[PDB]
Amino acid sequence: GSSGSSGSSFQSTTGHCVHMRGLPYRATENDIYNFFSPLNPMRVHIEIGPDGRVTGEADVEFATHEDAVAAMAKDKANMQHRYVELFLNSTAGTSGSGPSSG
C-alpha cells in the first residue's frame, strides 16, 4: 500500500516538528499558518475530539529545523484569545567544525 499520509512504522518524516496544545475553539489551520508566519509549515494536523469539536492540540511539521525555532517564536503567544502551548520537537542533524577534521 503506502500511498500518502498513512503508512507503517514511525519512520521520522523529517524530525523537525512542533506540538500544539491549548488552542482556541475558533482556531483553524489558516490561522495556525499565519500564527507561525512568516513561515511555511509542511502541514498542520488538527486533532478532533468527538467528530468535529477540536481538542486544542495540533502538530506542525517543518522541512528544516530553523522553520521550527522560527515557528517556536510564537510559543505561548496568544493566537486569538487563548494561550496555546508550543513544544519545540526536532531531531537536528550534525554540526560543529574545528581544525583539521579529526
CATH number at 73 reads: 3.30.70.330
CA–CA separation, 55 and 82 (whole Å): 13
Method by which the model was determined: NMR
- Residue pair 60/79 in contact (Cβ under 8 Å)? The answer is no
30 located within any domain: yes
Number of domains comprising the chain: 1
50 located within any domain: yes
- Residue pair 60/74 in contact (Cβ under 8 Å)? The answer is no
CA–CA separation, 83 and 24 (whole Å): 8
**Residue 44 β-bridge partners:** 60
Tell whether the torsion through CA atoms of 37, 92, 44 and 77 is positive or negative.
negative
16 located within any domain: yes
Please give the grid coordinates belonging to residue 56: 486544542
49 located within any domain: yes
Please give the grid coordinates belonging to residue 13: 518524516
7 located within any domain: no
Find the domain containing 74 and state its range.
Answer: 12-93
Helix (H, G, I), strand (E, B) or coil at 66: helix
CA–CA separation, 101 and 99 (whole Å): 6
Which residue in 39, 81, 89 sits closest to 56, CA to CA?
Answer: 81
Looking at the chain, how many residues does it have?
102
